Amino acid sequence: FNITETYLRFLEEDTEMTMPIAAIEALVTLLRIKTPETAAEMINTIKSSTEELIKSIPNSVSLRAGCDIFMRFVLRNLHLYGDWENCKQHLIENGQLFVSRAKKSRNKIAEIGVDFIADDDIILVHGYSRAVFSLLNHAANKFIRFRCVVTESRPSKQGNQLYTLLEQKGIPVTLIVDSAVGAVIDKVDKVFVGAEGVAESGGIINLVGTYSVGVLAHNARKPFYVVTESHKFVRMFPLSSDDLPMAGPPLDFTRRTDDLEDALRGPTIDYTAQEYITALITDLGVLTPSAVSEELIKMWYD
């Protein structure tokens, strides 16, 4: 039946779906075919499927996290010590429901937790996240005065895309160079983030250049922030400043081989430390200081 097929199914639309929410739904669908009463024929098989999915990955991180979340939910489900049927039914139900809840969470984020850009505080944003854009659009809707700042994305020309998505609203924006990042910290207020995953240590699993940005923020004491749909805590620990589970090579040292070729392999995933989160926008209420760690503890009961 495949989760991979389901994943393939959604491509051009989305924007509304939220990472694991779709993956979780797919998993649920996979489950509700091959008898969800038994535990020996089921949990192990699910795990195997997840492993297969992991193996099959080109460049995607949060899937694992989603799977883990699903597993946790499943574990939580069977503790009532009554009957196998009701619990099974509940399990079957909880996928579409979960998806629905995601939308609610997004709505909450967009109406309640949007009081960080209000007094024309110029926002420094890089890394395309859907939640960020939702926040932007709903700020425009509320008329809550604002200005936008985006550093040019040029590994695969997502910058242009971002610019286009900003033209829909109809508000002036500017191009920024990521080497001349030290040149402009003057009028732009704070640095906000759209990323790929939330770390076990505390920092953020993000794209091409972030550590430098973080450093600059620290120098300027203009607080660093992360804007996300809050269920992307990937089971990964960045123990050092340059060591992680990565989709590609870590700063690939290439040999002088051909003419104008082996250089375009830019390190398109990078990390910054735990002592940077002044606030993180979470759908379970605005909670940050050591929240991710707490969540992890709650999950692994340690």
Binding site: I185, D186, A220, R221, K222
Partner: protein, 266 residues
């Protein structure tokens, strides 16, 4: 000089002036006609005054002119007369927008006086106190600091919470710059607010705010009356080095990192 010392400690500029006077005295021989002598001596003194002060000020102004952008928001502290003059010039002579912000402390009403003067000339002023500074910053674009004396370290020996302001500037967006006279520099050096402290009587905060001469009945006035109480203060503090990058004198351009580059040339 001794009398002056007894009254209140003096500045480096004054010392320099004294030295110059001594040199002049050494120069003119006593065998010359007396009437003829001081006729020329006075002229020479006048010339010196014109050059090492007014001309220096002019030079400072011209430096500011080339450097300062098309209309600027300006922040200052104290009673830095040269800077006030420059501000006035900007307002009235060359004619540009002057959103000038002045900060002031409790013991001295220098800032207030400056503000008053600006008002009298017709300037839009923003008045500030100790409790907060950042309230106007978090907007503030270009800042000049209060000046008194410079050392051969690259540091500054200046008035009140200027150091705090400098620190704030360093933290938030942009560094600070100070313009001075070419005869302000010393060859003596220090690096803390414990080295040499400039003191007056602890009485500026005894009177409950408002005006200076009041004479009131209340509660304040316990220097020795109650069970052990001390009400001490400071006037001059240490301004830092890494933050005031700019220094402009009679030699036009340079950095405070070049702490005694002009001392050989003079």
């Amino acid at each position: 000089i001794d009398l002056l010392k007894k009254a209140r400690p003096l500045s480096v500029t004054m010392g320099n002036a004294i030295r110059w006077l001594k040199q002049e005295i050494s120069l003119i021989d006593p065998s010359t006609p007396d009437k003829a002598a001081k006729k020329d001596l006075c002229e020479k003194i006048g010339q010196f005054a014109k050059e090492k002060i007014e001309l220096a000020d002019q030079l400072i102004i011209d430096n500011a002119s080339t450097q300062i952008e098309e209309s600027t928001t300006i922040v200052t502290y104290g009673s830095s007369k040269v800077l006030t003059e420059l501000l006035l010039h900007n307002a009235i002579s060359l004619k540009k927008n002057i959103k000038v912000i002045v900060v002031d402390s409790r013991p001295l009403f220098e800032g207030r006086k400056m503000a008053e003067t600006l008002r009298n000339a017709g300037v839009n002023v923003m008045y500030a106190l100790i409790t907060s500074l950042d309230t106007i910053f978090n907007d503030v674009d270009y800042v000049f600091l209060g000046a008194h004396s410079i050392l051969s370290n690259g540091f500054l020996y200046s008035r009140a919470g200027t150091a705090m302001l400098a620190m704030s500037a360093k933290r938030r967006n942009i560094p600070v710059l100070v313009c001075c006279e070419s005869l302000k520099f010393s060859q003596r050096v220090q690096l803390d607010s414990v080295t040499f402290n400039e003191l007056a009587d602890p009485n500026d905060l005894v009177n409950i705010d408002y005006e200076n001469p009041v004479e009131r009945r209340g509660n304040k006035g316990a220097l020795l009356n109650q069970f052990i109480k001390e009400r001490k203060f400071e006037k001059k503090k240490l301004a830092m080095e890494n933050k005031p990058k700019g220094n402009k004198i009679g030699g036009k351009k340079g950095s405070e990192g070049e702490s005694k580059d002009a001392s050989n040339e003079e």
